[PDB]
Amino acid sequence: SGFRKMAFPSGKVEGCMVQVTCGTTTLNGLWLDDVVYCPRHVICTSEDMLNPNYEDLLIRKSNHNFLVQAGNVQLRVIGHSMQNCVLKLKVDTANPKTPKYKFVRIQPGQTFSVLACYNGSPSGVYQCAMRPNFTIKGSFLNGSCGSVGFNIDYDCVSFCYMHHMELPTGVHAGTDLEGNFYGPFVDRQTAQAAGTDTTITVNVLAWLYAAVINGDRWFLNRFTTTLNDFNLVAMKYNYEPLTQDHVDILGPLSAQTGIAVLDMCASLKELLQNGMNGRTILGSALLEDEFTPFDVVRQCSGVTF
Amino acid sequence: SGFRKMAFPSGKVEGCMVQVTCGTTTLNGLWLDDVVYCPRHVICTSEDMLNPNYEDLLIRKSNHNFLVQAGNVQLRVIGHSMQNCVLKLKVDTANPKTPKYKFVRIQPGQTFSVLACYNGSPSGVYQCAMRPNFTIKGSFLNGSCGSVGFNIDYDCVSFCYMHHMELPTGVHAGTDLEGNFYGPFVDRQTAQAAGTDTTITVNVLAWLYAAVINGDRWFLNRFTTTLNDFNLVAMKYNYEPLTQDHVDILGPLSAQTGIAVLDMCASLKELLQNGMNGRTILGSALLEDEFTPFDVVRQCSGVTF
Ligand SMILES: CCC[C@H](NC(=O)c1cccc2nc(-c3cncc4ccccc34)n([C@H]3C[C@H](C(=O)NC)C3)c12)c1ccc(C(F)(F)F)cc1
Ligand SMILES: CCC[C@H](NC(=O)c1cccc2nc(-c3cncc4ccccc34)n([C@H]3C[C@H](C(=O)NC)C3)c12)c1ccc(C(F)(F)F)cc1
Numbered sequence: 001s002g003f004r005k006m007a008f009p010s011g012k013v014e015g016c017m018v019q020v021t022c023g024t025t026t027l028n029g030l031w032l033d034d035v036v037y038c039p040r041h042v043i044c045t046s047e048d049m050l051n052p053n054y055e056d057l058l059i060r061k062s063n064h065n066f067l068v069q070a071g072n073v074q075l076r077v078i079g080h081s082m083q084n085c086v087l088k089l090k091v092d093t094a095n096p097k098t099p100k101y102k103f104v105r106i107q108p109g110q111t112f113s114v115l116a117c118y119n120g121s122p123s124g125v126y127q128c129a130m131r132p133n134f135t136i137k138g139s140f141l142n143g144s145c146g147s148v149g150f151n152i153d154y155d156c157v158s159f160c161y162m163h164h165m166e167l168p169t170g171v172h173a174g175t176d177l178e179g180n181f182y183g184p185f186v187d188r189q190t191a192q193a194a195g196t197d198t199t200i201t202v203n204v205l206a207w208l209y210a211a212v213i214n215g216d217r218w219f220l221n222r223f224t225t226t227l228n229d230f231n232l233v234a235m236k237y238n239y240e241p242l243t244q245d246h247v248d249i250l251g252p253l254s255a256q257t258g259i260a261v262l263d264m265c266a267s268l269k270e271l272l273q274n275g276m277n278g279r280t281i282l283g284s285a286l287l288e289d290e291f292t293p294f295d296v297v298r299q300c301s302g303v304t305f
Numbered sequence: 306s307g308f309r310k311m312a313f314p315s316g317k318v319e320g321c322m323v324q325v326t327c328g329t330t331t332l333n334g335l336w337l338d339d340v341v342y343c344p345r346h347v348i349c350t351s352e353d354m355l356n357p358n359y360e361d362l363l364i365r366k367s368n369h370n371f372l373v374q375a376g377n378v379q380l381r382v383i384g385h386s387m388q389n390c391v392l393k394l395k396v397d398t399a400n401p402k403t404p405k406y407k408f409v410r411i412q413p414g415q416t417f418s419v420l421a422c423y424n425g426s427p428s429g430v431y432q433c434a435m436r437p438n439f440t441i442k443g444s445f446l447n448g449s450c451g452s453v454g455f456n457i458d459y460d461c462v463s464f465c466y467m468h469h470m471e472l473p474t475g476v477h478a479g480t481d482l483e484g485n486f487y488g489p490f491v492d493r494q495t496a497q498a499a500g501t502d503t504t505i506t507v508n509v510l511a512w513l514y515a516a517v518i519n520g521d522r523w524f525l526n527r528f529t530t531t532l533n534d535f536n537l538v539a540m541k542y543n544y545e546p547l548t549q550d551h552v553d554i555l556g557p558l559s560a561q562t563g564i565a566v567l568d569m570c571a572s573l574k575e576l577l578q579n580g581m582n583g584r585t586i587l588g589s590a591l592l593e594d595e596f597t598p599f600d601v602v603r604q605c606s607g608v609t610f
Contacts, residue, residue: 001444002443002445002475004432004433005431006421006428006444007312007429007431008430009315009316009420009428009429009430010314010316010430011319011320011427014316015316116311117609118607118609121609122314122316122609123314123603123607123610124312124313124314124604125311125313125314125315125430126309126312127309128309137307137309138307138309139306139308139309139311140306140307141306141605141607142607143607170306170307170519170520214475280591283442283591285590286585286588286590298429299429300446302448302449305426
């Protein structure tokens, strides 16, 4: 029993964290084999942020201009290149602690673990979600650029996020590991802001199934609804449209609890229209939406790796 | 910016997790140097749980009766002993990944990270607190016995919890690393239940300071109260008494935000008497109490290790 915001074990990733210094700027880098990945704005200067030309800034740099420290060892840079908004520094040494890994670009609504770092040293690990508006509600301070987000699917680390910026509202924006930003954001000083967000409906439903698995049943009812009548109520409460694909993904959780997906949707409509009335669900007074169906199965069945 | 339930990086602990098998029972063990620690009820049989005599059960066991698997390597047991409710199996090999470590027995209200494991393999990491009633609200399934809780204070791992049981209400109970249970619980089948719990007041106040640090100010007021008048309101809402020591611990957070502790207490009294009125604090509609003052400073200042 129990349900927590559970992050993946971080050790496989900790062994890859390094420190990259260019001039006065210092941030974190990801050391995989003999390449170090980090945000390309480590090359910028604070006075040249309105519109930096990254190709020009990079041709004027040399291999000795990058200080890469891995713990108590300095790494020698033997080459550099740029891929979208990430900088790739080839080093003369391959990381012996390199895990089995992939680079994945995830969809909004999926979750990952963040290993926040400062000066190459891991500080903490937490779970978060890619919001529908392609921001993340992380916990980041100055120096955390280059921290990565990741998932694990057996022994393979799937990296999916590298941290680049904090927007004015305090949320965060960054790229996949091939340097493509999530959302319409760019690594330059503009008036860009996070758009309006919505609630990840399929995730709320999974978290409701997680509650049933753990003994919370006060919110269920005898009713059922259609996909159309539910999406009409969802859109009124700023919820993501629920697709038939979502209903299919919620299949295994529906069979484990014997509650049909459209039956669970009727409970959700009631909860949106009437609130919780002083009651809580899995220790929350709000409808949580940062648990994917896979997260629920992972925690309520107990898969390792 | 941002505030998350942040766990410590788990890698130092992952390298110590093993699998211990005695007869048909299998649970997790903690491999530090040449000793493997695990719950002593791994020696029991399912039919002899009403009142097992652990001294008798242990004299009838031999070194070959314990199977200790560390990954894809079997460890040879060269001795066994019992310390309170933990079993200590000396192995012929010292763990090369043994970190710098201590064993600490923590106070109710303190937090730690849990690395949940099954069959020796880490599954996930989450934060939790020792409740005033000496239970923890963890996330544990069959096979998670032997998972440990821990803190990090530089490069030293301070182990403080080993998981033993899940009580009827779904909360969990276990021991420190020297085998002494937290609370009045015992590793035998009785009618024991978790006592009535209270809210960790000093932790709520720290989490309120964390909110101010992150831009949430709607709950502040101009008022102040005394320690006595506040504790009179706290006891009415089933909150832990606030001591002068607590007020001293909240010192640095009070100086960073310029809000006096007794001023923050006046905000808390108002929030208890009137609720939140549809508003949230740091993304919660409830008053969170699983953040210690040190956790807040760690996340809002960014210490690593
Ligand atoms: C000084 C050379 C260029 C400059 N490089 C950094 O400044 C920087 C350096 C090292 C670690 C860093 N760690 C962080 C950081 C991470 N997460 C949360 C935070 C919260 C508060 C303060 C800082 C952070 N930054 C800052 C750059 C990023 C930003 O959004 N600028 C508008 C935040 C770091 C930069 C300016 C503007 C941008 C823009 F694209 F947003 F405009 C990007 C980079
Ligand atoms: C079979 C030999 C003895 C027996 N040994 C185990 O049974 C056991 C074995 C391996 C991994 C285990 N992992 C778990 C487990 C951990 N966390 C959450 C869980 C949630 C649901 C189910 C199981 C768990 N257990 C169970 C023993 C503990 C308990 O409270 N019994 C009343 C839970 C494990 C045992 C019975 C009673 C007690 C008592 F002291 F509570 F009475 C203790 C142990």
